[PDB]
RNA sequence: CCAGGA
């Protein structure tokens, strides 16, 4: 009865962008991206990759409440570097890493006879 | 599986709840409390079967 | 019921999905609520005046420090209390990754990454350090527990300077609904609105940390050492003889009654006293043999749940059973059960439960514990209405 | 259903307590909490 | 509730991915709080579980009968024969990160009961409604749309 | 901006009372007899046994937020093996010309007893602890 | 070859045992999550009941029909009805299944997932076939009928993900382990006397070097090398649970890059 | 009543395995633990599904209409 | 050996017979 | 006692309570259905007029 | 059970012998030796509370019969068969329990009231109440979709029809601190 | 009244 529809977890709302980038007030060159209809699956993945970027000073994500599929990701970079670009690169690195993972699995699978 | 032991009265299943009582025809002695003229009483709740 | 002004408090609405009224855990205590199937009432003011009354006089933050006992009536509980001890041990160090999430989780965080307590080899932060981010500036606290020095070797007591923990482990005495409390000081020093924020803050950090650290409790936590069990068995064994010795002494008419007591009254007092001395010894044996890794000990240590007796009764020995203060009496003519001989004043006959819950109870132990158990349920039942009318 | 067909009512010294004489005849655990506690026996 | 006076309502429902998991791929159906057990001293709940874990693996009926010669040690030995750690603990991994939990979780089957008290038959709200005739005050009970 | 204390001590005892990853160390200065030291160390990170000679340094520098890498090109003010950052919490006047200063490195406690460093140590959040050998 | 590497240990119709090295735990997990939740599958979603003389409820049966695995090989060429342009469903977005069963026999008449018949045009794509792994070739036992017990119904199967309902979950349990010797100190082993004696040694211990006590703690050490086992239900073949999982997560990340692009 | 399709905990189809299990017991005389394991039911979550099932449907069928 | 003392498991064979005959509502019926 | 010292009242609501680590101390999670029933009578004023017209 | 000093060979021994036990289990396989058969053969007797006053009962037969002429530590601490006077023996001590308490697994390992609580809650637990549910018109009926027999059971449940008509399901349960929910 | 829930 007070139960929300199951698609609300993944299907974007009426006039609701996937990303909402707001700037952090408390810190210089820091931003806050709210990811709608997303969970840990993506949050922790991105956060961990931004951690690999040397020019990235701060990176963390939080699912403020479990009833809602959305998470806030805070990115802080060195002066001159843009946090949107930092996010862009980490996103790219992830894809390229997954691309190799698929290629490598495919090759190895084809070798099996079962 | 239905065990019975109940009655059907105007549609509904009714249980006769067993009622606890003290047994009759029984001699019992009790000390009647500190403020009393009588100190002890022998009681018998006599009743026919 | 509503036997308190704190049993009716003003809250901010938060429309949410699902059919239940959700409440912050620390507000549980004033209401006296739990989530075993409790229901709660909601009343809506209809005037600007009425609303003001609620927001300005009876709002939850205002109600934190209560006049009932001139101390806080809400504190940190359960998961957050349990996790708070665990987080604040010297042993507890957090890697950069998690520190960043733990920091971001604090809704009022300055954006300042605190300098790690350990800078190389490998930057590492302590629990104490990252918890202190929830503690507001200006907050000063000092507490000395048994054996606290300015060097706090056992991580005893508490020392918070400028809303930064210097030493000691955070638990019930520090972060609970305690007189000297971190909460008592915060409400008083910073405000009710600031203190209410601190509850949320302390929990958002702690709960997050414990979500990833995890915490459990198993049968293994009731299990005590092989030799500790031999030592416990032989503690009951010697107390069992000490009792027979006073019994033989009483049967031989050598016993000398204490002024203002029956020869028998005097005897029962001794028996009951030895048997309890025993249950406790046996208990204190296990309590000591359980390592700091014991999940039960861990809950008892933080003050989150359970006490000494619970360990004792579970691990070592349940103990003597009472009804109307006295041991199990002779319901049957000169005996407690038909499985006993007449005029049996032995511990086993008059309701001494020798075994731990882990070991299991004998049918006799089981029934006597059942008699003793029923007594408490009767007063719980009665007291409820007697207590109610007194209030009225 | 089973436990309802084995229920005992006691209307009106210390009746609520579990007596020694209740051994093997009445359940030491199956009794209500509150008002009827120990006045509703189960065989 | 379990068969140990260990009652409660659902606080949240999590999907399989959010849930903590054994390396073996097993996930709980139910997460109950450690804080229940100590104050309550419901040891048989823990034993029920250990025995039920062995029972599930062994395919034999786990005898949880009262006065017997079954010991927590006896069952422990049998569980070690099955490859699990004797006291029922199992190492779990956090569902959100995949990182091992610093704690090992007491995990196994336990017989849980569904009770007659469900939130939707309880939930009730009113704001002006039927009134009594005599007193001209709000009628009684959820049933009657009372206040 | 500069160093505040320097001396080489010798560890008398190492204590992990219930603590699995931390140890209270007892040392005395090889140079000054008056000088002693009590200190909690992450022994899982930098292990310490008794009779080890250790260079113990203070220094108020090398403020605002903390930055992780770039330290490759940055001047690692550590010619030392284990470094900590903590706060000075008490100034004990232990008779005569003798003083004792208390340092908390986020719970990891330290007590330095001596005399001379009147013109050095201060009640500051800023105080690093450097250890080599 | 390049970045993260795979080394398959065992294969079948139902299982993939492998080793994932040169990867972030976060990545290993995110893939694990996706396989469970975000891979699309076909499953019965609407059940119109014409007749039911059974001992079971209309919805009791209905529920089961969703849990029956259907061929989702070519699931990728089927549209989500939500995205489709019709009114309710069509061929471009659904598979229509039919089930007519009757107790002709004096003996108990069984109703199986094999008794399902496709009535919609398949556009010649590998879809909607009730998955039969059964030795005797019956598949899932839906119902039991006696004599005049008739069951006549219609099923509309739709493309979906496990987030909406666990029926669209193509994977059973996913096994996941790392560091079988606790070299990383990621767990503090609960024990009574000895944690080594008390806790069972992992299978994967053989695929890693024991720590050798006479060595200091490697703090610098990080988590790479993950021993996993992916189990399929039928809808998609074991390999494709892994591949499609890798691909879904890749697509999921691309959406973010694209979102930034539109901004 | 009536074998669950899919194990609640992991969702391994268990709907097909019922008759096969009941057969490995009457016809093969085999003990419950081996039959379950033969049928490839390795995780206890899956084991409990079959091992603890009560097929009430069979009684339900005993009534005429 | 048909006159051998009874074991503890054998008490269940008697309990089986008690219930085979009396049933659970013996008292209500009788 | 029953009609005067105490009264049955409108703008009341009752349900099962459950805890939340993500609510702020002073707030209360209110089910959508309960919020959709309980009402506040707000006076149309220049300040709220537009907002109010929208909820209407 | 009746116990008699009456035994040519040795001590005071329980009238019922392993021969009667097989004589009963023969009749158990047939579905001629009933409960009435044990009652008329004077092996077993009916004792009310007033009569109980004058008897002397052994809990276990075997454990509480032949005297002493190492010991497991995990087992509970038990007393002895000191009595040579034994008139009767307990059929089974678990029989002191009623219908509801007889579904409690290991009630000898729980705190007294926790047991009293379960024998109140199980009355409110859902499951199949009767197999004829589909043919009866009752106000309210709650039936569990997929009931499961318990993995941990009582020997007493055999008679209670519990494994045939269960009140719950065996859930995979973790006792853990998770999201604090 | 009766049965139950915190
Ligand atoms: Mg409650
Ligand atoms: Zn379409
Ligand atoms: Zn499973």
């Amino acid at each position: 009865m007070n139960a929300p529809d199951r698609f609300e977890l993944f299907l974007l709302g009426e006039g609701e962008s996937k990303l909402k980038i707001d700037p952090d007030t408390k810190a210089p060159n820091a931003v806050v991206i709210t990811f709608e209809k997303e969970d840990h699956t993506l949050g922790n993945l991105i956060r961990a990759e931004l951690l690999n970027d040397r020019k990235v000073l701060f990176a963390a994500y939080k699912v403020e409440h479990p009833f809602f599929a959305r998470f806030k990701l805070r990115i802080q970079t060195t002066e001159g570097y843009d946090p949107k670009d930092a996010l862009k690169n980490a996103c790219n690195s992830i894809i390229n890493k997954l691309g190799a993972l698929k290629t490598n699995f495919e090759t190895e699978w084809n070798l099996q006879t079962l | 599986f239905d065990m019975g032991g109940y009655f059907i009265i105007n549609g509904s299943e009714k249980v006769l709840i067993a009622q606890e009582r003290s047994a009759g025809n029984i001699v019992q002695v009790f000390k009647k409390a500190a403020p009393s003229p009588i100190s002890h009483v022998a009681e018998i709740r006599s009743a026919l079967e | 019921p509503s036997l308190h002004k704190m049993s009716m408090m003003a809250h901010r609405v938060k429309v949410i999905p699902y059919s239940t009224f959700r409440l912050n855990l620390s507000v549980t205590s004033p209401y006296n609520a739990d989530f075993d199937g409790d229901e709660m009432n909601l009343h809506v003011p209809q005037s600007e005046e009425t609303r003001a009354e609620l927001s300005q006089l009876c709002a939850v933050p205002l109600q934190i420090v209560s006049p009932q006992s001139n101390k806080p009536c809400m504190g940190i509980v359960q998961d957050t209390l349990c996790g708070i001890r665990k987080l604040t041990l010297r042993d507890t160090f957090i890697e950069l990754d998690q520190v960043l999430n733990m920091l971001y989780w604090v809704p009022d965080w300055d954006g300042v990454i605190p300098t790690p307590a350990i800078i190389k080899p490998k930057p590492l932060w302590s629990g104490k350090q990252i918890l202190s981010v929830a503690i507001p500036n200006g907050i000063h606290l000092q507490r000395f527990d048994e054996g606290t020095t300015l060097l706090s070797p056992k991580d005893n007591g508490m020392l918070i300077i400028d809303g930064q923990i210097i030493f000691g482990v955070v638990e019930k005495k520090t972060v609970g609904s305690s007189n000297g409390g971190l909460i008592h000081v915060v409400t008083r020093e910073k405000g009710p609105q600031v203190c209410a924020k601190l509850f949320g803050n302390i929990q958002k950090v702690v709960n997050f940390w414990l979500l990833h650290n995890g915490f459990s409790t198993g049968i293994g936590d009731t299990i005590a050492d092989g030799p500790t069990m031999r030592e416990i068995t032989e503690t009951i064994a010697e107390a069992k003889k000490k009792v027979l010795d006073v019994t033989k002494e009483a049967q031989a008419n050598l016993l000398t009654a204490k002024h203002g007591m029956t020869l028998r009254e005097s005897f029962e007092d001794n028996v009951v006293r030895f048997l309890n001395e025993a249950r406790d010894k046996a208990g204190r044996l296990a309590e000591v043999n359980l390592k700091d890794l014991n999940n039960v000990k861990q809950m008892v240590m933080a003050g989150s749940k359970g006490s000494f007796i619970n360990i004792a009764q579970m691990s070592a020995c349940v103990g003597q059973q009472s009804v109307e203060g006295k041991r199990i009496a002779f319901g049957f003519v000169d005996r407690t059960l038909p499985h006993f001989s007449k005029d049996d004043y032995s511990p086993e006959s008059k309701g001494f439960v020798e075994n731990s819950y882990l070991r299991g109870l004998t049918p006799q132990e089981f029934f006597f514990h059942a008699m003793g158990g029923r007594e408490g349920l009767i007063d719980t039942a009665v007291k409820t209405a007697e207590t109610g009318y007194i209030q009225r | 259903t089973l436990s309802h067909l084995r229920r005992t009512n006691t209307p009106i010294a210390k009746p609520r307590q579990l007596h020694n004489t209740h051994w093997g005849l009445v359940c030491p655990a199956e009794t209500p909490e509150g008002q009827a506690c120990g006045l509703v026996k189960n065989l | 509730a379990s068969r140990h006076g260990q009652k409660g309502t659902i606080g949240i429902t999590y999907r399989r991915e959010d849930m903590p998991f054994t390396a073996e791929g097993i996930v709980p159906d139910l997460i109950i709080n450690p804080h229940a057990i100590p104050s309550r001293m419901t040891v048989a709940h823990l034993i029920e579980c250990l025995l039920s874990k062995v029972a599930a693996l062994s395919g034999n009926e786990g005898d949880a009968s009262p006065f017997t010669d079954i010991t927590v040690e006896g069952i422990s030995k049998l569980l070690r024969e099955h490859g699990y750690q004797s006291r029922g603990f199992e190492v779990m991994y956090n569902g959100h990160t995949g990182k091992k939990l610093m704690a090992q979780i007491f995990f196994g089957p336990t017989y849980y009961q569904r009770l007659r008290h469900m939130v939707d038959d309880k939930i009730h709200a009113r704001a002006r409604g039927p009134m009594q005739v005599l007193t001209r005050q709000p009628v009684e009970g959820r049933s009657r749309d009372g206040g | 901006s500069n160093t505040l204390f320097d001396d080489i001590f010798q560890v008398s005892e190492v204590d992990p009372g219930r603590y699995n990853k931390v140890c209270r160390i007892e040392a005395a200065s090889t140079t000054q007899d008056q000088c002693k030291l009590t200190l909690d160390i992450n022994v899982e990170l930098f292990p310490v046994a008794a009779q080890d000679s250790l260079t113990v340094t203070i220094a108020s520098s090398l403020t605002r937020s903390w930055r992780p890498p770039q330290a490759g090109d940055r001047s690692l003010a550590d010619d030392y093996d284990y470094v900590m950052y903590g706060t000075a919490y008490k100034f004990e006047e232990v008779s005569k010309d003798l003083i004792a200063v208390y340092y908390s490195f986020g719970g990891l406690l330290m007590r330095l007893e001596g005399n001379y460093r009147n013109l050095n140590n201060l009640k500051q959040e800023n105080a690093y602890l450097l250890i080599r050998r | 070859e390049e970045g993260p590497q795979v080394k398959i240990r065992e294969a079948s119709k139902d299982n993939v045992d492998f080793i994932l090295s040169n990867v972030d735990l976060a990545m290993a997990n995110s893939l694990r999550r996706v396989m469970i939740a975000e891979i699309p599958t076909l499953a019965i979603d609407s059940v119109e009941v014409e007749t039911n003389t059974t001992v079971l409820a209309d919805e009791f049966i209905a529920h089961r029909l969703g849990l029956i695995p259907l061929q989702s090989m070519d699931i990728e060429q089927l549209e989500y009805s939500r995205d489709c342009f019709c009114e309710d469903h069509c061929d471009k977005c659904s598979v229509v299944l039919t089930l007519q069963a009757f107790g002709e026999s004096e003996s108990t008449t069984n109703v199986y997932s094999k008794d399902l018949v496709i009535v919609s045009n398949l556009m010649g794509r590998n879809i909607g076939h009730p998955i039969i792994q059964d030795k005797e070739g019956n598949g899932v036992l839906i119902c039991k009928l006696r004599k005049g017990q008739e069951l006549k119904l219609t099923c509309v199967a739709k493309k979906g993900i496990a987030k909406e309902h666990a029926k669209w979950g193509p994977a059973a349990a996913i096994e996941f382990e790392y560091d079988p010797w606790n070299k990383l100190k990621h767990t503090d082993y609960w024990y009574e006397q000895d944690s080594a004696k008390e806790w069972p040694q992992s299978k994967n211990c053989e695929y890693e070097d024991p720590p050798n006590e006479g060595d200091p703690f490697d703090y610098k050490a990080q988590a790479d090398t993950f021993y996993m086992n992916v189990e399929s239900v039928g809808s998609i073949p074991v390999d494709q649970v892994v591949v499609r999982g890798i691909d879904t997560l890749q697509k999921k990340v691309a959406s973010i890059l694209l979102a930034l692009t539109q901004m | 009543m009536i074998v669950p399709v899919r194990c609640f905990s992991c969702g391994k189809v268990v709907g097909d395995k019922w008759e096969s299990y009941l057969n490995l017991l009457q016809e093969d005389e085999l003990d419950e633990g081996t039959a379950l394991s033969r049928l490839g039911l390795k995780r206890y979550c899956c084991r409990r599904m079959i091992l603890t099932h009560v097929d009430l449907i069979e009684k339900f069928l005993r009534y005429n209409p | 050996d048909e006159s051998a003392p009874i074991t503890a498991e054998d008490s269940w064979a008697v309990i089986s017979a008690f219930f085979r005959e009396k049933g659970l509502v013996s008292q209500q019926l009788d | 006692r029953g009609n005067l010292m105490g009264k049955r009242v409108d703008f009341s609501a009752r349900t099962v309570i459950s805890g939340d680590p993500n609510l702020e101390l002073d707030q209360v999670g209110v089910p959508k259905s309960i919020a959709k029933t309980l009402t506040y009578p707000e006076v149309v004023t220049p300040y709220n007029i537009d907002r109010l017209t929208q909820l209407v | 059970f009746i116990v008699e000093d009456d035994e040519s060979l040795g001590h005071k021994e329980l009238k019922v012998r392993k021969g009667h036990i097989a004589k009963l289990m023969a009749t158990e396989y047939q579905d001629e030796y009933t409960w009435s058969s044990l009652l008329n053969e004077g092996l077993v007797e009916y004792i009310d509370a007033e009569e109980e006053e004058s008897i002397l009962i052994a809990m276990q037969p075997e454990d509480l019969e032949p005297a002493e002429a190492d010991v497991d530590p995990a087992k509970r601490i038990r007393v002895s068969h000191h009595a040579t006077t034994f008139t009767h023996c307990e059929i089974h001590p678990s029989m002191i329990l009623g219908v509801a308490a007889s579904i409690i697994p290991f009630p000898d390992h729980n705190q007294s009231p926790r047991n009293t609580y379960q024998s109140a809650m199980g009355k409110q637990a859902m499951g199949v109440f009767l197999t004829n549910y589909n043919v009866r018109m009752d106000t309210m009926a709650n039936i569990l979709y997929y009931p499961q027999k318990p993995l941990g059971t009582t020997r007493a449940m055999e008679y209670l029809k519990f494994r045939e008509l269960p009140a719950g399901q065996n859930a995979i349960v973790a006792i853990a601190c998770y999201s604090g929910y």
Side-chain angles (χ1 to χ4, degrees), chain G residues 173, chain H residues 7-12 14 43-49:
Chain H
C7 154
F8 313 126
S9 311
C10 77
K12 207 298 126 282
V14 147
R43 294 176 301 270
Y44 50 99
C45 63
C46 305
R47 305 190 116 258
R48 64 100 200 248
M49 221 61 53

Side-chain angles (χ1 to χ4, degrees), chain E residues 28-57:
Chain E
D29 287 331
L30 217 77
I31 317 179
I32 72 157
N33 209 286
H35 297 112
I37 300 286
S39 43
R40 285 181 235 285
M41 298 175 292
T42 173
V43 186
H45 191 284
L46 304 150
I47 314 165
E48 204 222 279
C49 183
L50 194 77
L51 168 82
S52 279
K53 204 184 185 180
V54 159
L57 303 157

Side-chain angles (χ1 to χ4, degrees), chain G residues 177 179-181 200-210 227:
Chain G
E177 197 192 271
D179 194 47
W181 305 101
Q201 267 221 40
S202 166
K203 174 210 185 167
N204 316 316
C205 277
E206 290 168 281
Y207 305 74
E208 248 179 65
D209 285 321
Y227 312 86

Side-chain angles (χ1 to χ4, degrees), chain C residues 73-102:
Chain C
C73 70
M74 283 162 241
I76 271 73
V77 210
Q78 293 221 337
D79 282 24
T80 322
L81 187 55
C82 192
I84 210 157
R85 193 190 116 276
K86 293 214 77 190
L87 179 73
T88 58
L89 317 154
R90 265 189 268 274
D91 264 2
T92 303
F93 295 96
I94 302 126
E95 274 179 79
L96 172 69
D97 45 73
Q98 202 190 171
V99 164
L100 304 192
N101 297 303
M102 294 217 250

Side-chain angles (χ1 to χ4, degrees), chain G residues 55-56 60 64 67 108 110 112 133-134 136 139-141 144 146-147 149 167 169 172-173 175 231-233, chain H residues 1-6 10-13 15-16 19-20 42-43 55 57-58 60-65:
Chain G
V55 292
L56 313 195
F60 180 112
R64 320 185 101 239
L67 280 89
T108 300
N110 282 22
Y112 299 100
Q133 288 158 305
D134 198 284
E136 318 83 48
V140 156
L141 165 58
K144 290 173 189 187
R146 63 127 49 181
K147 46 197 211 166
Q149 317 246 286
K167 73 183 150 166
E175 300 197 341
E231 180 166 355
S232 182
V233 190
Chain H
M1 113 250 321
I2 223 287
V3 210
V5 188
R6 281 144 132 161
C10 77
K12 207 298 126 282
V13 271
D16 37 357
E19 299 164 282
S20 321
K42 101 117 197 203
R43 294 176 301 270
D55 206 62
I57 177 147
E58 285 283 357
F60 300 170
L61 296 168
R62 291 202 64 186
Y63 304 88
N64 284 288

Side-chain angles (χ1 to χ4, degrees), chain F residues 1 3-4 6-8 24-27 30-31 39 46 52 58 61 75 91 96-97 99 105 109-110 113 115 120 124:
Chain F
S1 302
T3 308
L4 296 165
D6 187 26
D7 207 290
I8 302 130
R24 190 151 297 206
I25 260 90
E26 227 57 51
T30 334
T31 321
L39 168 66
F46 158 67
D52 290 22
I58 292 172
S61 180
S75 64
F91 272 61
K96 301 157 181 72
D97 292 10
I99 212 82
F105 306 92
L109 303 181
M110 194 216 200
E113 194 185 71
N115 150 40
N120 276 324
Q124 307 168 126

